[PDB]
Motif scaffolding. Sequence first.
Motif, mmCIF file in Angstrom:
data_model
loop_
_atom_site.group_PDB
_atom_site.id
_atom_site.type_symbol
_atom_site.label_atom_id
_atom_site.label_comp_id
_atom_site.label_asym_id
_atom_site.label_seq_id
_atom_site.Cartn_x
_atom_site.Cartn_y
_atom_site.Cartn_z
ATOM 1 N N UNK A 79 0.772 -1.150 0.095
ATOM 2 C CA UNK A 79 0.065 -0.021 -0.018
ATOM 3 C C UNK A 79 0.819 1.438 0.096
ATOM 4 N N UNK A 122 -13.785 -5.482 -0.272
ATOM 5 C CA UNK A 122 -13.362 -4.519 -0.131
ATOM 6 C C UNK A 122 -13.761 -3.403 -1.287
ATOM 7 N N UNK A 137 -15.655 -0.106 -0.311
ATOM 8 C CA UNK A 137 -15.030 1.365 -0.678
ATOM 9 C C UNK A 137 -16.443 2.274 -1.383
ATOM 10 N N UNK A 184 1.484 3.383 -2.987
ATOM 11 C CA UNK A 184 0.333 4.600 -3.440
ATOM 12 C C UNK A 184 0.347 5.795 -2.289
ATOM 13 N N UNK A 204 -4.041 -2.758 -3.699
ATOM 14 C CA UNK A 204 -3.264 -1.812 -2.833
ATOM 15 C C UNK A 204 -3.878 -0.464 -3.065
ATOM 16 N N UNK A 205 -4.302 -0.167 -4.094
ATOM 17 C CA UNK A 205 -5.074 1.125 -4.417
ATOM 18 C C UNK A 205 -6.447 1.061 -3.539
ATOM 19 N N UNK A 206 -7.208 0.021 -3.591
ATOM 20 C CA UNK A 206 -8.186 -0.330 -2.694
ATOM 21 C C UNK A 206 -8.005 -0.154 -1.444
ATOM 22 N N UNK A 207 -6.901 -0.657 -0.660
ATOM 23 C CA UNK A 207 -6.401 -0.664 0.499
ATOM 24 C C UNK A 207 -6.290 0.950 1.097
ATOM 25 N N UNK A 208 -5.761 1.781 0.413
ATOM 26 C CA UNK A 208 -5.429 3.270 0.540
ATOM 27 C C UNK A 208 -6.871 3.818 0.457
ATOM 28 N N UNK A 209 -7.778 3.476 -0.162
ATOM 29 C CA UNK A 209 -9.234 3.948 0.002
ATOM 30 C C UNK A 209 -9.917 3.596 1.040
ATOM 31 N N UNK A 210 -9.611 2.401 1.372
ATOM 32 C CA UNK A 210 -10.455 1.797 2.560
ATOM 33 C C UNK A 210 -9.670 2.644 3.944
ATOM 34 N N UNK A 211 -8.438 2.766 3.904
ATOM 35 C CA UNK A 211 -7.765 3.323 5.105
ATOM 36 C C UNK A 211 -8.326 4.816 5.256
#
Lengths: 353, 347
Positions: free
Chosen positions: A99, A296, A300, A102, B6-13
């Motif tokens: 992560x 996820x 989102x 990004x 990883x993009x999705x995870x940054x958004x979830x964070x």
Amino acid sequence: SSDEEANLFAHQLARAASLPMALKAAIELDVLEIMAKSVPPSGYISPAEIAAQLPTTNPEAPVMLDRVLRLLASYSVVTYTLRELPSGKVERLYGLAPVCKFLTKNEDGVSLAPFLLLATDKVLLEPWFYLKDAILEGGIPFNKAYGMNIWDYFGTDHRINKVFNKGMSSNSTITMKKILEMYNGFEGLTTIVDVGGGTGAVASMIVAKYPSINAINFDLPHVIQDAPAFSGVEHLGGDMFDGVPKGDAIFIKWICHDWSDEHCLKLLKNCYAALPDHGKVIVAEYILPPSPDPSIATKVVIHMDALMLAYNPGGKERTEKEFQALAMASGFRGFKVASCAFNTYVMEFLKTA
Amino acid sequence: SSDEEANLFAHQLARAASLPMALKAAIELDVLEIMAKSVPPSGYISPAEIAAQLPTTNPEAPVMLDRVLRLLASYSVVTYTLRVERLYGLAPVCKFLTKNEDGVSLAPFLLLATDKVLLEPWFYLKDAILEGGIPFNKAYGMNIWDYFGTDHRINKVFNKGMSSNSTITMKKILEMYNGFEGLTTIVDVGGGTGAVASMIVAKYPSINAINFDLPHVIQDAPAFSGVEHLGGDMFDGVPKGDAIFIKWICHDWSDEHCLKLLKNCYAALPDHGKVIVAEYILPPSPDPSIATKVVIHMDALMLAYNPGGKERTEKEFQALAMASGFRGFKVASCAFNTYVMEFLKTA
Ligand SMILES: Nc1ncnc2c1ncn2[C@@H]1O[C@H](CSCC[C@H](N)C(=O)O)[C@@H](O)[C@H]1O
Ligand SMILES: Nc1ncnc2c1ncn2[C@@H]1O[C@H](CSCC[C@H](N)C(=O)O)[C@@H](O)[C@H]1O
Ligand SMILES: COc1cc(/C=C/CO)ccc1O
């Protein structure tokens, strides 16, 4: 001990905000960047080594940093390894998880870090204290908190206007790079209007890929004032609800989700008027899945829908059918889902099909 | 692929703060209670049927509530079914967010955790790391306990939050731990509005208890048979008893401050007395277990709020016991992620 698991979960729910706020501090301290550039061949670096690169020099900095990095590590935001010190005690050393690719600057200087700073800004967290009020009273939680629509408030408050525009620029840069590898629909246009284009990141990327195309970035005056000049982009200020610049196609990314169905139809009729006979609107949005599943990708989109309820006048996430319905009711005869990248769909609303 | 994830995870964070604020809104609207009392045997109820019990004539209330419940459903906070309209029900965690048989839940605890006052310090974390000091104090110009003694609202929110969480944990602890047997006088130091003291007295009517905390807390304490509420400052000293109980007190304070308190405790006790400590105990790594995350989250919260407050390992707790004069130490019991230690005056 179904009880034990439920009591734990309730605790986890109660403290969930601490994770993004810990991450925010880590970004505002430049910790992840310090990590990317300092890490040895192993992959890991100590909080003491990190902290020597910060402007402090608080003797408690290294331990405070370790405590923050430990929280991020528990959620795999950063990686960790243990090392036993002679001075028996074991310390954590930290590395970058996937992560972080990004959350730190890529080869072109872009990341999602400014998007995270927007998401965790005091101004965007305040409307959430007025959710109950809006439900019972009517209206918009943001407007209860600030006394005006979000866009008008941004026009009053230079700091958050900049944080917001930088945050959208960053997120859009990352997503549109991927959309432009998959989507071919800009090929052959001679002029493209980005309506609600912000500071013009997307317009600039389109021009860079298609040097012959003339792009117009259209947004509110208070946004357009900060847009950097990019050769091949003209920044125009105005109000999309009064009308939009003319072009061969119009691109709207994350605009429809900000607005009620009625506002969307108003916008889309203005886009229809601005286009030539066979032109199109290119819509870049999330698409709502059929259910609140625990994936996820769904989570989102549903989170965004809830953000739209907190922030915007009638904004919400929509299904493919709902989008097709908007196209139809504003006069378009065709509809296509054309492409998808990083959870963002590109739809085309065609004036002729 | 990996990039997409990883993009999705940054958004979830990025948006994880809103999950608890959505839950806060649901609790403030009384939605979970309305569901609990109103669901038919299917277990599910429509947002329109919930909204019809709210004090509103906003015609959009149903759809607004639907959207909020959808988010909670995605996180398995509430359940759902399709009839397409969504109906919603209670997931197992809701048993802790709605009143149980005894009239108690963690809902007041969630309202504490999500209160505007306690979210504000987190905006000054970066300032405290770089300049020193305490994020709370940067926000409010005084320490947390002093702020509570100026703001009746937040005082009440905090004490009810602690009371609710402690009542739930302590009931389980008291099924498990027998070390209160045989005392005549227990002092609960930093015992808030007295829930824990009142539970000790109720299980052992032979014990008499002193519930000791700051005056602005004791002012709001309800009366309970065999508990005496006593205002003061634990750093000046503590009341005498056969044992002292300290729950979620050590973690509020640096090692130097814990020692000051612990020496006070030593002095208020007879030669044979003990200090009974209820705290989380830090596990040996930032593993992904929810139990470990919860303790690490609390450690980070102590970073935001308190002067040198922090979570500790067993070894560290035993070192505090040694350094304050206690010659014995044991980990006695555990329930709902909370350990009970005894710091014993003799070997
Ligand atoms: N009436 C109006 N006319 C033009 N732009 C508007 C508008 N109201 C809001 N906006 C713009 O709509 C944008 C929504 S945020 C999306 C920005 C950009 N398309 C991106 O995806 O990065 C903001 O830049 C905002 O200022
Ligand atoms: N100097 C002092 N003396 C007495 N109590 C104090 C104190 N400083 C803080 N406190 C009290 O310490 C408590 C910390 S929170 C824990 C409350 C209770 N033991 C429970 O677990 O539910 C508060 O009630 C606070 O008012
Ligand atoms: C109000 O408009 C938007 C807001 C966000 C979230 C910003 C978080 O502070 C994301 C997309 C949008 O179009």
